[model samples]
Target chain A: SSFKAADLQLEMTQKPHKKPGPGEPLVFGKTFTDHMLMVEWNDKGWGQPRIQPFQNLTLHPASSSLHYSLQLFEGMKAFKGKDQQVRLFRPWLNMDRMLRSAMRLCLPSFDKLELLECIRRLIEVDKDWVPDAAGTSLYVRPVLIGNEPSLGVSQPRRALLFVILCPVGAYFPGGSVTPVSLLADPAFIRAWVGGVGNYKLGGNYGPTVLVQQEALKRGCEQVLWLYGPDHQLTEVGTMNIFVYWTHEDGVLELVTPPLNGVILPGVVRQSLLDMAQTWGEFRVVERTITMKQLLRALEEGRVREVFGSGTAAQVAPVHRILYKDRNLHIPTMENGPELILRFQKELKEIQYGIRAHEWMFPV
Target chain B: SSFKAADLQLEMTQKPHKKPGPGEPLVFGKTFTDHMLMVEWNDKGWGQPRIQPFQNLTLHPASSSLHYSLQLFEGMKAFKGKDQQVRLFRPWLNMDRMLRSAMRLCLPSFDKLELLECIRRLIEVDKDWVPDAAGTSLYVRPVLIGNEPSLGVSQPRRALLFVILCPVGAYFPGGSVTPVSLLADPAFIRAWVGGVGNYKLGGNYGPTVLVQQEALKRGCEQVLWLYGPDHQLTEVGTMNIFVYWTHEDGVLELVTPPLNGVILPGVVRQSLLDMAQTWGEFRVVERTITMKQLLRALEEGRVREVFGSGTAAQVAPVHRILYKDRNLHIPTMENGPELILRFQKELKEIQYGIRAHEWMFPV
Candidate 1:
């Protein structure tokens, strides 16, 4: 099969399903669209990408993906534009990261832009699945799995790459963005020096679920991963952590963890950095941030605002951090959010076609 | 409904399949038997177990197992004794470990002994597939997967547990038992403290595949994982590491890393410790061994043998350890077979029902 996106094959489903109406809650990932894209690979090479009806996938019981966690995934969305067209935001970056992840799992790599175009065609087929609400979009999940039938701790000779669409409400509950508290503990580090933390491999997410449950039980919405003895902040749960504060010399700076192998180089995280740096109002830097320095800045009242950034919500505000049996309170602007609200609004505007941007691909 | 093994429904295949000839290579996990065991679970409860023809499994595209690695498996073996009876070695232990692994992945748990009995029945149905060669046995893999048709980093609402049987030969390529070289690298750490290293989760193994490939390229059979600043020896690839040495005070000692959440509690590792302790020949201890200390011991010619222990390979003897930029070799006894051979022989005897105890379960 050709590697070009134009070479994709479309297979229409005989059955068309009902769309979730306005009254429906549209919980994330529950209700799927009518069609999906699937492809197969082996030791030979990649196969033709095909779009078909959303359905079950048949696999051998001994697939390496199930036994060895040889799998990776990407999270993306197709927004219903104001002009009655479907739009995708920065889909290439997700595919790029997904390409890196696929190779990490010893799978075949493909052209990121070509895969993006294939996904665009997929969205076109199920464009109506894009919800018609103020805060709703069709969530796109592309998962690649090693379906090799035999079991050994090596790369799979056979693989399956499939994409599914789900009508998702707000990533956070109640369809509203709000300040979320975090649990920061050095005892439970998320990723380390030589780990696959940077890759979007399925391996990273499973380990965090137990820790996430612990955070939810402790009344925190997310887990802030702290690394090393210095407790250098790495990430907030599944998202990249960001701190907008006045520096030691009173210079306003926006800082995030560097693109170290231990930190996932998230697309939204990059988007925020790009947006903030282009503004040229304050210094936007990526550096290692220790909890000690953060607490000291909080004590000095120099800490302006802290937040988590990712594709789902764009920016989730952080109000509290529970670290080492101590509650670290964060200060927020009395009037409203400054940078976070701006990032959310601007990103949403681009996503919803309120503003024209090259990053948004019209499907 | 019922969790009892006796209650399992059996649907015999209408047509039987051909068995592998005596001349077959009997490669590990490459070929499967004619039948398999399947079970399903959800928020409701565990369904009745069923035994049917071996086949591919159909799963939803958004299955948690494919996306988040919400899956676990137990590697076990059933031996065909000279008396023509089928014997399983410490299967209850595997079931117990599998139970712990299921809970770790947020999947539903079941009765271990009951499940073990169900597997016993499953093994009996396919006993002819169990080879009668000197080292061949039926490798039984019981895999539990989160089959929920939704995607998110949370507990799955639905799951599936299936058992597949593969007649396996020697786990390593070489047929004869021999000491292997190990690559010791601190930068490529296998597992860290406060991680799921002690558990047999799919998440823990995926990250190590690339490392394993690197070790193979470096001419080492396995990787000797080093942790912390002192470079404490944690594990050897997938096995629990061990060393037999004379202490500074001239006391003969057998040492392994403590189960402090960084070392897998391997069944063969535990069995070796139990047998060694009962022999009263040397001091058996579980503690950390730094690479520096090991090198010093090797230089002084105090180390008798270094080996790795796991279910697949009962005792994998280690002859050379490559660390940093130097290689350290272990001295072997020329007069008599070392403890590694003795352990393997006894374990095999127990497994083959030649010198059996309560640990051997008859099918």
Candidate 2:
């Protein structure tokens, strides 16, 4: 049998820290709440869930995660609405993705609702930590790792699943969002066919650090990952890429790379697709877009906007792409990025409970 | 300045554990020696090396290694000689590869000699743990991981380097060596170009666990990783692959994949190439070998032997490969894997001090 929220063992902390002061910078993942959720798994199956004081983890010297990279994670958020109620944004989607990642790494699986219940209980136990400041919410990081004390590169016999909450401001610093520059180089490819690119495995993220550093060195904020001889755009840094352009046949379209086993199926990417298709606005497509086609469109003034979508930054606009010594300027910010702002507003309303969407779950 | 062995701090374990009994089954990586070596690193530089009792590690919940897979490891062996001396086999190669792995992940770089000195001291402190049984040796595991308590997917500001020793028997179980079979499916690829496959990062190993299980489900012992549309043979399991066959020109040749940025530069792989070229027995070459060419060779009865080379198994002969829907049989065992056995003997002799060589370092 798998782990159950019904068997949760709660242990409140004796010492509670003061909440962040107004205007105090809450870095992406620096500060955490007073409590955390943990579940241990062994050959017998998942053990009782424990909600205990947030502290250090005591792991064996030869834990599989430290040596074999047997780990996966999910990023989500909890928002405090204007009505002073706690809400979670599409947490079931995160749970589904988390399960897929666990399966990809051969980690033990668990019921999604049970894990979701534990997370809700965790937020309820520390709801005060959720910032009420506009554009601020609690970042939830759920990680699963193989803690088995063995050196062999095989399925782990023991594992640990834990959740930590950190209140974070805007993913991008400053009062307003700024368009990010991307370095597009075929010399660096983030994911590939027949690999774990679609999964949120730690292995997929770690190797990209050096490549991301290269982008920074080249006067860009993030990497515009390209794959194949055709130089098809796969992703923008850690987020999914979307291009808003005028098709050759005179049709306005918003295109994102298909989930061809090489692109991560992000929750935000799906939500945007769902929203756009429901609106019946310009053609929303899931297809391949090569540099050749994109540059051609840009040359013809057909490219209107390009942006990255993820949990961290609801929508990150792209203004420039540096590829092979040629910096192609994208006029996303110059054209006001009207669609991006509207999408952000729509997402925030649904997330913060202003719009009252079915995607949000109350704590 | 970096860390130095001169600043070593030693702390012996108060409670000593009993060594493995004679004729006992020493599973690989299951048991460890009494003490271990560790060094901390930060933006400033490396800290003093410490030899302390083997125990659990207390890590922050948001440790970078656990979430981003910012970790790497090296495997080496120390053997007990007939002269009652302990010897390390080409440890410098491991250090070199380890430094490269560190650079790939943006981890702090250290003086290889300094780290080697610390390891030497560690083994000396527990020299009695070196097993005396034939085909037995102490496995040396050197690991470096980002321990900084941060969630950002970037280069870590703080890291930890550690070394542990484990005494074990042969990599493959039972008396005498047995031939292993592999599954070569293009649906699952381990590494690729423009990736960190050349490095010994933990990420490279984790994603392959589920694929290895798939191979096992198909009745194969390990995976024969293939690459590209041509289905070029890459590595087998965690080791470098070798194929001996008579070329189409009627010339005998031993071929392995070239280090074209995709394949790992294994110490054993390098040593084998060095030894074979020096012997001038046959044409030793580093080139691509696709499944098509290998299958054609087997059809013509030109295939001599196939095997994998690594630290754990030293040399593992291959008898069959399940690729697509067919099992390609390569009579490596039926026709006698003479070259593999000879290579194993040569390596063991030099490692155990039976035949002292420059590669062997006395402890």
Candidate 3:
């Protein structure tokens, strides 16, 4: 049998200390909670899941995680609602995505429901760490690494799954959301067909840091990842990009890159698409849109707004794109960022449990 | 002043023990020596270099290496020559490649000469681990990982560089070499333009494991990493591929995929090309060769031999290629593997110090 919730072993931290107070200043992914959840895996199967004190990991120098990057992680936030109850937003989606990532790297799989139960219990034990601020929450980070104590490039025989919680503050410092500028350089591609960009593997994210740094150097906030000879827009930074524009036929449409093995199936991306489709107001499309097509729309004055969606930034508006020595100014903020603000408001309501929805799971 | 060998601090292991003797059975990367080389880095600069007992690393759970794959490595070998002297083959190449990789991930860089000197001393300390048997040597693995104790995707502020030595046995168990079969599937691409495929980053290697497993299931020993719509062959398994065939112009040509940002600039690949070019007898060209072109050559009986080259494999003769639904029989072994055997023999002579060349650096 694989690791199950029934085999959970809890050990409360004896050195419990107070974390940052609600609405207090906190850096994202910097402040950790009192305890963490860890489970070991081997060829035999998964070991008993243990909730222990937060500490460092003692890994072999030749650990596969360090040598081959046989690692994957999931990000899910635990929100403290107005009712003083802790809740998770669409965690099942994360479970499904994490399992897909684990399979891609040949890591051992387990019951997603059982792992969810274990995470629920862990949050229950540390419920106080869930910040009660307007835009603050406990960022749940679940990481799985192949720690086989060898240096070969193969599926590891041993693995480690651990969950760590960080108290993160709001995305914006003030109560105002600012649109970000992007560098749409075709020289830097993020994901390719038959690559692991669709999965939440560590490999997909690491290589983008240099490109991000290049974007910063070029007076842009994020990188607009383009793919193929036609330069189809795939993603923006670590989020799925969306473009809302009026077509030549005068029909309002929102478009995002398809899940063609190169775009990550982000939780927030799916939620936004689902909510938008439910309204049945405008045409929502998932298809390839080339840079040339977007530029043509801009020249024809049919472009409306553009933005990115992810778990961290529920929805980030786009204002400017620096492409091939030209700055194409997106009218998202100028157009009032109407849809972006609406998605943010609605997502926040569901996340904070202001509106009761099936997506919210009580801890 | 940046982590120089002059500031090296040594701590010998107290518990000395016997290792597998020369010509003994050994598994690649499974066993390590008594000591390892380590150096830490921060924004200030690199710390003092230390040669201490080989031990596990104590890293924070939020280390970027485990979460984002902010890690890179190099593979080198130290041979105990027939003259009873330990030697390193073109270590400067690894240094240059490693520095290039570090820059891609935004990890701290160091003086290449200083780092090479430190490695020389570390190998000197663990000289006993260098096997004296033919085709056996100590595999020197130098790894650099971003150990930033946070979960943000950025250039890590803290980093660790460590080197470990593993005594590896012959590639072939017996004296005879065997050709391998490859699965050339375009659905599985290993690298692409504007990506970190050319670098020896941990991210590039981990994602290829599942594809390699798929090749094994398809009755192939390794994956012939194909790229683009033309099904151009880029690499084989972890090595650079080569094609020795007679061209349509009645010229004998040795061809490999060019260093076009998709293929790794391998050391053995470079050495073989260098030696072959020096001969001036045949055309040693670094250019793209698609599966269709190769298949046409096979049909015309112009295909001579096919093989892969790397530090570990040196020269792996390829016997068959599984492309699409056809198993194209490669006559590498049937054609006597003339060029493949010549490259392997020449490289081995220089490696074991049988040939006194400028590439060999005596320890």
Best by DockQ: 2
Candidate 1, after superposition: displacement of residue A74 in Å?
Answer: 0.8
Model with the higher DockQ, candidate 1 or 3: 3
Cα error of candidate 2 at position A135, Å: 0.4
DockQ preference between candidates 1 and 2, better one: 2
Q: Estimate each model's TM-score.
A: 0.96, 0.99, 0.98
> Which of candidates 1 and 2 reaches a greater TM-score?
2
Model 2's lDDT to the true fold? 0.91
What DockQ results do all the predictions give, each relative to the true complex? 0.73, 0.89, 0.88
Q: Which ten residues in a row have the lowest lDDT in candidate 3 chain B?
A: B16-25
TM-score of chain A of 2: 0.98
Please state the error at residue A282 of candidate 3 in Å. 1.8
Task: Kindly report the interface RMSD of candidate 3, rounded to 1 decimal.
Answer: 0.7
TM-score pick, better of 1 and 3: 3
Poorest 10 consecutive residues of model 1 chain A by lDDT?
Answer: A169-178
Per-residue lDDT of model 1, residues B1-363, tens digit only: 436676789998888877876656776688888999998887668888899998888888888888888888898888998998988888877888898888777788888878888888888889888887787788899988888887768878788989999888876555567778888887786677777777888888877877877888999978888889999998888988988889778998999989888887787787888889989988999988998888888889888888888877878878788888687777653313378778877887888888868888899
**lDDT (Cα atoms) of all candidates against the true structure:** 0.84, 0.91, 0.90
